[PDB]
Write a protein that binds this ligand. Structure first.
Ligand SMILES: *[C@@H](CC(=O)OCC)[C@H](C[C@@H]1CCNC1=O)NC(=O)[C@H](Cc1ccccc1)NC(=O)[C@@H](Cc1ccc(F)cc1)NC(=O)CCOCC#C
Ligand SMILES: *[C@@H](CC(=O)OCC)[C@H](C[C@@H]1CCNC1=O)NC(=O)[C@H](Cc1ccccc1)NC(=O)[C@@H](Cc1ccc(F)cc1)NC(=O)CCOCC#C
Lengths: 304, 304
């Protein structure tokens, strides 16, 4: 038993990380077969930051303006292109460590692992959710751009996030690996704001199932409610509305515990309305919303 | 900015995980050069559990009673010995992915990453602390024995933990890679109990500095204290006493924030006595004690 903030093993991704330098500017890139993907603002300076003319910047740059290093050894760039907000550097060497992969766009409320990297070298791996406002509550410093988020489905790495920027509220924003931002953000230094964040209800329910599987059951009573009555309560605490699709995906956890989803909803309604009464659940004194139902199934059943 | 429960990149360790089977019992081993390390209770059965006679069980077995698999390739066993509570199986081929490594014995309060594995295949990575009572609060299911904990000192993997068992209180116990248990535990299925657990004070203080670096300051007060007076408060709330060495280890975070350690001690003292009164710190409503001072520096400075 036990329940931890658990990331995917990062080995497959670690072998794909490189550093990409253009002039004075260095960040991280992802080396898959003979292509390196990185944020296109590697070709910018601060003179360009408000209205960068990316096509002009790139056409002034040539294959030799790009320095790509894997570990500490240089790869030769032999071609460059731009796809939305991502640069695609064709290199002379295919990466022999390339895993089976897919580029995916995740949905808000879903989770991924983040390999945080600096100068092409991995620093650490943590678990993040895509917030309903299309930001992530990451841990990133200067130099971390180009770090990627991913899930592992079977033996395929599904890359879903590339890091670009930090908003002044301390939250982070970036693109999928096709270069399109999550949310209403652009890679220019205009003042940008995320909408008001909400709590991811289905994940809270998932984590309360994780608590029952692990023996923390004090909040469980033989209570139940309806979907509509739960949602009237949820919006009062800025929880996202629970749909019957959310109910269905909690099926596996309900199946293993014998607690019907709307019974756990009744428990959650009682926690929002009465508080936690100084108690903890799974070591936390707050309701946690960054474990999906799949996350719970995976580590409460040992998927490998 | 930001702050996450961050684990080390696990790639170097993933390349060391194998499956070890003895009879119908299967768990994980660690393959380094031409030796595989795994818990010795792989050679047991149900009747043995109360008081396994391991020397008898081991001497009676032949190398052919041990099935070691690295992915889908057998490693032939050519020797089988015991060091304390770990079995060492000599195999015919050295691991081509053997990293630079050391076996280290860590102290209570230190953190490490855990690569949870099943049937020799990595499932996930998370961060743990060695509790003052020499247990850990991990996430382990049946089949996870032989999973290892580790730190990375630049390029050297410092293996510090191998997983053996779960106590009935929900916590976990194991050995170092020389086979010696942490704490007073033994690998017999007998009523065993950890001493009273305590909070790791120096770690909470480190996490308060991480909060300040991320702009949470509401809990700061103007008072300073002495180490002697603070330690009287720590004893009252079953916090570990703070040593001058702990103070000095916090020095890099004091250097970054300009807040003296004994001023931050006075802030913690008020938090212990009166709690947080509805407020949060780094998105938590509890004092977190599983980030060491170095963990914080590594995230609030970007060490790779
Ligand atoms: C990655 C850049 C890099 O590695 O290459 C340069 C050597 C960094 C990642 C951040 C640094 C701090 N925390 C991070 O996550 N990205 C930036 O520095 C970007 C560059 C940029 C991207 C898109 C559009 C314009 C510029 N800048 C920022 O993140 C800045 C500026 C900004 C604010 C709001 C917004 F919508 C776009 C850009 N962010 C801040 O300065 C907020 C303060 O917190 C960060 C710090 C310290
Ligand atoms: C790893 C063994 C394995 O992989 O075997 C392959 C067939 C497991 C890891 C645990 C499974 C449950 N939670 C875990 O962390 N280890 C065990 O199953 C050990 C085997 C054992 C090791 C040393 C000495 C005796 C037996 N048994 C347990 O962990 C049991 C029994 C026990 C309790 C207290 C104590 F001090 C020693 C051994 N623990 C429990 O039954 C309580 C937890 O129940 C959760 C379940 C299932």
């Amino acid at each position: 038993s036990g329940f931890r903030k658990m990331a995917f093993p990062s080995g497959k991704v670690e072998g794909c990380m490189v550093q990409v330098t253009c002039g004075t500017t260095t960040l991280n890139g992802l080396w898959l077969d003979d292509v390196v993907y990185c944020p296109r603002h590697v070709i910018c300076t601060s003179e360009d930051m408000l209205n960068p003319n990316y096509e002009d910047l790139l056409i002034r740059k040539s294959n030799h303006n790009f320095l790509v290093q894997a570990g500490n050894v240089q790869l030769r760039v032999i071609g460059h292109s731009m796809q939305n907000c991502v640069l695609k550097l064709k290199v002379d060497t295919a990466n022999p460590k390339t895993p089976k992969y897919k580029f995916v766009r995740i949905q808000p409320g879903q989770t991924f692992s983040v390999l945080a990297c600096y100068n092409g070298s991995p620093s650490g791996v943590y678990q993040c959710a895509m917030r309903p406002n299309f930001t992530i509550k990451g841990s990133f410093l200067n130099g971390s751009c180009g770090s990627v988020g991913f899930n592992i489905d079977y033996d395929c790495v599904s890359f879903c996030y590339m890091h670009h920027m930090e908003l002044p509220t301390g939250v982070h924003a970036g693109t999928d690996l096709e270069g399109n931002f999550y949310g209403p953000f652009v890679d220019r230094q205009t003042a940008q704001a995320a909408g008001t964040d909400t709590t991811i209800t289905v994940n809270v329910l998932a984590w309360l199932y994780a608590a029952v599987i692990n023996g923390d059951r004090w909040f469980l009573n033989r209570f139940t409610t309806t979907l509509n009555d739960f949602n009237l309560v949820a919006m009062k605490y800025n929880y996202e509305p629970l749909t019957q699709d959310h109910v269905d995906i909690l099926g596996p956890l309900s199946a293993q515990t014998g607690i019907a989803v709307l019974d756990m909803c009744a428990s959650l309604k009682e926690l929002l309305q009465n508080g936690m009464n100084g108690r903890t659940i799974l070591g936390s004194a707050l309701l946690e919303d960054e474990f999906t139902p799949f996350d719970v199934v995976r580590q409460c059943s040992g998927v490998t």
